[PDB]
A paper describes a structure:
We determined a 2.8-Å resolution structure of the 70S ribosome of Cutibacterium acnes by cryogenic electron microscopy and discovered that sarecycline, a narrow-spectrum antibiotic against Cutibacterium acnes, may inhibit two active sites of this bacterium's ribosome in contrast to the one site detected previously on the model ribosome of Thermus thermophilus. Apart from the canonical binding site at the mRNA decoding center, the second binding site for sarecycline exists at the nascent peptide exit tunnel, reminiscent of the macrolides class of antibiotics. Unlike the ribosome of the Gram-negative bacterium Escherichia coli, Cutibacterium acnes ribosome has two additional proteins, bS22 and bL37, which are also present in the ribosomes of Mycobacterium smegmatis and Mycobacterium tuberculosis. Sarecycline (SAR), a third-generation tetracycline-class antibiotic with narrow-spectrum activity toward some gram-positive bacteria, including C. acnes, was developed for acne treatment.
Using local refinement on the 50S subunit and the head and body domains of the 30S subunit, we generated better quality maps of these regions at resolution 2.9 Å for the 30S head, 2.8 Å for the 30S body, and 2.6 Å for the 50S subunit. During 50S subunit EM map analysis, we discovered electron density within the NPET that is consistent with the SAR chemical structure. The second molecule of sarecycline (SAR2) binds in the proximal region of the exit tunnel, opposite the macrolide antibiotics binding site, near the PTC with its ring D close to the PTC and its ring A extended down the NPET towards the exit. In this position SAR2 interferes with the growing peptide chain, as seen when our structure is superposed with an E. coli 70S ribosome complex with the P-site-bound tRNA-nascent chain. The oxygen of the carboxamide group attached to C2 in ring A of SAR2 makes a hydrogen bond with the N6 atom of A2245 (A2062) of the 23S rRNA. Ring D of SAR2 stacks on C2768 (U2586), which forms a non-Watson-Crick base pair with C1965 (U1782). The hydroxyl oxygen at the C10 position in ring D forms hydrogen bond with the phosphate oxygen (OP2) of C2792b (C2610). We observed direct interaction of SAR C7 moiety with 23S rRNA in the NPET. It is hydrogen bonded with the oxygen atom at the O2’ position of U2767 (U2585). In our structure, the position of U2767 (U2585) is not compatible with the correct orientation of the aminoacyl moiety of the A-site tRNA, and hence SAR2 should inhibit peptide bond formation.
Numbering used by the authors:
A (entry chain c): 2 to 275
B (entry chain 1): 1 to 44
RNA sequence: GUCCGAACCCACUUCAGUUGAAAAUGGAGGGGAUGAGUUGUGGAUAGGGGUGAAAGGCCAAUCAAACACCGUGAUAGCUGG
RNA sequence: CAAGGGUUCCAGGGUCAAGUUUGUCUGCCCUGGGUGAGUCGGGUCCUAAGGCGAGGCCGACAGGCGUAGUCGAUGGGUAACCAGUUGAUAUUCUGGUACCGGCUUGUCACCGCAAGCUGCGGAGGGACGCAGUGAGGUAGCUCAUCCCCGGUGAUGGUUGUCCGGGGCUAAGUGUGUGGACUGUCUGGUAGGUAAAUCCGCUGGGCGUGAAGGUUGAGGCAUGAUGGGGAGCCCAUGGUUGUGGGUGAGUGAGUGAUCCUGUACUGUCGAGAAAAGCUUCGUGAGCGAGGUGGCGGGUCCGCCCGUACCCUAAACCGACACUGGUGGAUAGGUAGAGUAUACCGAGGCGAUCGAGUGAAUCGUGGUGAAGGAACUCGGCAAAAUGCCCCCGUAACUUUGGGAUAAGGGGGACCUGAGCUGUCGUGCACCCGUGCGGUGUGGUGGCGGUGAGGGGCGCAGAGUCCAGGGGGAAACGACUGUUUACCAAAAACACAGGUCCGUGCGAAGUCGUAAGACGAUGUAUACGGACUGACUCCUGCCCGGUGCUGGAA
RNA sequence: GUAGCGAAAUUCCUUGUCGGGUAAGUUCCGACCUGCACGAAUGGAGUAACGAUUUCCCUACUGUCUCCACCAUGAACUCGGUGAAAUUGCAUUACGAGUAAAGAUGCUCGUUACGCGCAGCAGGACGGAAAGACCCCGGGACCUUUACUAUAGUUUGGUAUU
């Protein structure tokens, strides 16, 4: 859930924080961590390619199993539910019944002690992983593979959810959390249930410092720049862009998806609109 | 106040050292040009 | 990213300096001082490029396009000789 | 000390130059000399960021990137301390006492498809945040009628506790007090690149309700019959050191930034890597029936640095420049304090002077009466200032506003009782031979003190140390910015909305490969504008742009 | 052009008008609307808290002032030592009224003035320092756009790969 902070100080006034009720362990599994040095948004050429990235608390990467099909038929106990700084979801530490320990995105509702499993003959329970041909139509899943064997790629963030709506032929139709209707191979795997920590979006950070140690550098809007720095720059006093809205590199606002690629597998566009 | 030159032998050797100059073809041509001029110090 | 306040970091006011002690400081006060803090070492990004909590700021004491060399004895209906 | 400098260090000779003056002097000149490590700091070991990169992929050429690897400290790993000595060196030399790795040797014990060694990896371990409180200690400090070594005072007193000084010793080893850690015995086993008897995951039996075992803050013992430590000696030699003459080592108070301690508690923002190390096997070779273990002895232990300056006259600033320069140590009294005042350890008197009541400029000081009449403006200054106690408004997002405002007390003498701690001692549990425990002690030291009293103009008596209240505009806020005329109402900001993006994402760097985005997956990411919060955010799609459509 | 707001960081006229504050208020705070030329995310109107921000007022307080005086100091000043600097066509370099490239130490007519120093003050030498930074003319640079001509990129179809 969310715990609201009291307005003792400014910057703490309207802010809030998760209460971490679902965490059962305040430390990570040492054998599943790797170093994750920060990039600062810099390319292999050393230049900033993604802006507004830098600083923040040090983090260690947790190795998450997005495949789950190399342990088919081996039951696992959910040993722990714990915090992952690298994502908005929680991670379930699983003890497979052969000694192997692993991490998964924690599905909503699963807790310490429940038994997960993978395979075509796996039971339909949240946390179980099955092929889409075996997942029944109308099921809410997550961690969905685009291409069979490629690993989980869709529906992974906190509260994410994918709806399996049809299984015609060798394609399964899924509604993604964007609302877009997509066709994927029936052999693609998916995990039953939706992602937990669904209420994290309501967190009010209330403080520039909290994003600063979340790793977000300040954002300078282009309209207060100089004309050399941004197409919106220039002007005496406060102005608009002096033109239609554009990117810092002069690209006008508009659709940017490549119209010729895997569009033959997209049923309907996300339809954000308004 | 704090001035422009703040010495550091390791940084100097990594920047203008002989091996640094030999690493790239521009630096090798610089060494050749200094040899033609007759400098006693080909590099730092 | 609480309060008062040393170190530390800053640079609001004033006076002095302004062929200075100093090519930006000193005296007296002043802001921050557990934080978006400060600092050491090493490293990365390079010139129509970098970086910029954005002032066209900064990039080796003069940056609306660094410095060095070269084209080069550039050109100048202009000034001087 | 580090960085940086590079002989400036020491001794002797010198006074052209240099030194903002002089100079017999010097960080200057000349000559000679000076830096000693198995343990200190680096290398021989390990990796981070990052660099390079066999093949390789990419690119007209030049080149870009990157695999296997290989480098790269600012981190990990790693065995020594005290004393003494020189004109110049010292965890380096010398003395004393240790430790580590080799080689070799003596002795005891043990192995044998089946020793071992070396490679190779598995696992364990190394291995990690921030904030805070408390407890047990020690360093240090203070005091002393106690112990030592002195003193008996130029001027009234000063032979009793009156005055001055001192009251010390390391690493290592042993011990095991606090504290901490820890059930035990077998079985199985989809995993750990090849394997595993070492790990992981699981099944049983038994199991104190802790008891042993393991560990190790300090203490004690040892190291240490040693080392260090004052004034008395025929004498020394007269700014000197020699041989004897070293005397003491107790107790209490106070108390850390250190130790237990990566402890404990809280907490979200969720806090390197690799090797050494322990153990496990064997995807490799070596290797003989020879090795590997435990106490004892001999020899071997490499390279670089080591002088000197270093909050500076030696470094960065052209200077022997009121500037800048990272880290460690940092005592006493007053004090909350690392502020400030005066002092200690120790170091300095500053690198032109001597005078002289000129105007004037700078820097401080005081001021009658008035009190902002000054002035663009209360600019500058003054006042206020500390602790304890009382008390405190509009408004408010209920947190604030607030140190609001506005008051009282403070130091000195004496001092009843109350307390912290120790104490010879009483009895007692004693597992005693425990390095203990609970009662319990006239007292010492320290803290606190109701009341009573003294003196002065003045008791936060010096230094130090908010003025306050009312109202409006702007920005919510803490922050950021024009290094060197603008710190702001500008930027950022948390929050908000819109647009893009289904992942080889969009976007961005690049010719490309690639890379960032992200080891992220629409509760995400990128772009745009707005800028906490409250109440709201109207009408217009004709123009331009965007989106869709295609007669 | 709605809510709201309005002589406002926006109001030219303008010190608008009225009201408050002062003995006196072009500023200030509250109103009016006649909005030269407010207005709703380039957000509208508010807002506790915050501010080395801007503005007005009260109090305290003072050398800010009436109106300055005095004290001590680092320079100044004298002596000894050491010893620069910018500047410089020249020199035995007065004033007055004139005159002249229209602002004279230097020319005219007059007036005054013994030679040389020391400490001072700043009216002039159109004083020194910087080949005016304003203006114009020539050149350049960067910036902008529905200026021109091109181009990376993005996109269309053909064709090769097929
Ligand atoms: C308010 O009107 N007053 C009368 C003017 C003025 C007033 C106060 C100032 O403080 C300055 C100025 C003029 C500007 C001129 C600037 C100019 N530059 C911007 C191109 C220039 O050309 C030089 C220069 N180095 O030649 C400068 O000095 C300059 O940069 C500068 O600093 C200035 C000032 O300081
Ligand atoms: Mg491990
Ligand atoms: Mg590169
Ligand atoms: Mg951004
Ligand atoms: Mg992240
Ligand atoms: Mg601007
Ligand atoms: Mg542009
Ligand atoms: Mg613009
Ligand atoms: Mg405008
Ligand atoms: Mg420099
Ligand atoms: Mg604070
Ligand atoms: Mg400093
Ligand atoms: Mg300033
Ligand atoms: Mg001045
Ligand atoms: Mg503050
Ligand atoms: Mg570099
Ligand atoms: Mg501008
Ligand atoms: Mg510069
Ligand atoms: Mg150019
Ligand atoms: Mg630029
Ligand atoms: Mg030519
Ligand atoms: Mg010419
Ligand atoms: Mg001319
Ligand atoms: Mg040296
Ligand atoms: Mg010499
Ligand atoms: Mg020398
Ligand atoms: Mg010397
Ligand atoms: Mg001399
Ligand atoms: Mg001499
Ligand atoms: Mg000498
Ligand atoms: Mg090696
Ligand atoms: Mg690397
Ligand atoms: Mg090659
Ligand atoms: Mg290696
Ligand atoms: Mg190395
Ligand atoms: Mg010495
Ligand atoms: Mg020694
Ligand atoms: Mg020795
Ligand atoms: Mg390992
Ligand atoms: Mg870790
Ligand atoms: Mg006497
Ligand atoms: Mg004593
Ligand atoms: Mg196995
Ligand atoms: Mg295997
Ligand atoms: Mg204590
Ligand atoms: Mg040495
Ligand atoms: Mg030394
Ligand atoms: Mg020193
Ligand atoms: Mg100095
Ligand atoms: Mg120097
Ligand atoms: Mg005290
Ligand atoms: Mg002090
Ligand atoms: Mg002394
Ligand atoms: Mg000294
Ligand atoms: Mg000097
Ligand atoms: Mg005089
Ligand atoms: Mg005064
Ligand atoms: Mg008096
Ligand atoms: Mg007076
Ligand atoms: Mg008076
Ligand atoms: Mg008064
Ligand atoms: Mg007045
Ligand atoms: Mg007046
Ligand atoms: Mg003032
Ligand atoms: Mg004052
Ligand atoms: Mg209060
Ligand atoms: Mg008060
Ligand atoms: Mg009393
Ligand atoms: Mg008083
Ligand atoms: Mg005080
Ligand atoms: Mg108003
Ligand atoms: Mg106003
Ligand atoms: Mg602000
Ligand atoms: Mg704001
Ligand atoms: Mg601020
Ligand atoms: Mg900054
Ligand atoms: Mg400035
Ligand atoms: Mg945002
Ligand atoms: Mg892309
Ligand atoms: Mg990537
Ligand atoms: Mg804005
Ligand atoms: Mg239309
Ligand atoms: Mg329209
Ligand atoms: Mg269209
Ligand atoms: Mg008016
Ligand atoms: Mg007006
Ligand atoms: Mg009026
Ligand atoms: Mg609107
Ligand atoms: Mg608008
Ligand atoms: Mg507007
Ligand atoms: Mg606004
Ligand atoms: Mg507003
Ligand atoms: Mg307000
Ligand atoms: Mg301010
Ligand atoms: Mg008044
Ligand atoms: Mg004087
Ligand atoms: Mg003289
Ligand atoms: Mg005339
Ligand atoms: Mg005349
Ligand atoms: Mg005349
Ligand atoms: Mg004449
Ligand atoms: Mg004179
Ligand atoms: Mg004079
Ligand atoms: Mg004059
Ligand atoms: Mg002039
Ligand atoms: Mg000119
Ligand atoms: Mg100029
Ligand atoms: Mg000028
Ligand atoms: Mg032009
Ligand atoms: Mg230019
Ligand atoms: Mg085509
Ligand atoms: Mg085609």
């Amino acid at each position: 859930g969310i715990r609201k902070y009291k307005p003792t100080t400014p910057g703490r006034r309207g802010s809030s924080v998760s209460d971490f009720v679902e965490l059962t362990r305040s430390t990570p599994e040492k054998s599943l961590l790797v170093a994750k040095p920060k990039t600062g948004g810099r390319n292999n050429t050393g230049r900033i390619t993604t802006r507004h990235i830098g600083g923040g608390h040090k983090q260690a990467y947790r190795i998450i199993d997005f495949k789950r099909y190399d342990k088919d038929g081996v039951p696992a106990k959910v040993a722990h539910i714990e915090y992952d700084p690298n994502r908005t979801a929680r991670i379930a530490l699983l003890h497979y019944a052969d000694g192997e320990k692993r991490y998964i995105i924690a599905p909503d509702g699963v807790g310490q002690g429940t038994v997960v499993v993978s395979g075509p003959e796996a039971d339909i329970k949240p946390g179980n992983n099955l092929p889409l041909r075996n997942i029944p139509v109308g099921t809410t899943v997550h961690a969905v593979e685009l291409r069979p064997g490629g690993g989980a790629k869709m529906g992974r963030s906190a509260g994410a959810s994918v709806q399996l709506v049809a299984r015609e032929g060798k394609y399964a139709t899924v509604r993604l959390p964007s609302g877009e209707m997509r066709m994927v191979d029936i052999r693609c795997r998916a995990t039953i249930g939706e992602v937990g920590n669904a209420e994290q979006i309501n967190i009010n950070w209330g403080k520039a410092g909290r994003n600063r140690w979340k790793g977000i550098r300040p954002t300078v809007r282009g309209v207060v720049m100089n004309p050399i720095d941004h197409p919106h720059g220039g002007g005496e006093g406060r102005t608009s862009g002096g033109r239609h809205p554009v990117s810092p590199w002069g690209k006008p606002e508009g659709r940017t998806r490549n119209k010729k690629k895997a569009s033959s597998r997209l049923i309907v566009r996300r339809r954000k609109s308004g | 106040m704090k001035r422009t030159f703040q010495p550091s032998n390791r940084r100097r050797a990594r920047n203008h050292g002989f091996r640094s100059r030999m690493s790239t073809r521009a630096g090798r041509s610089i060494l050749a040009a200094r040899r033609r001029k007759g400098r006693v110090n080909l590099s730092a």
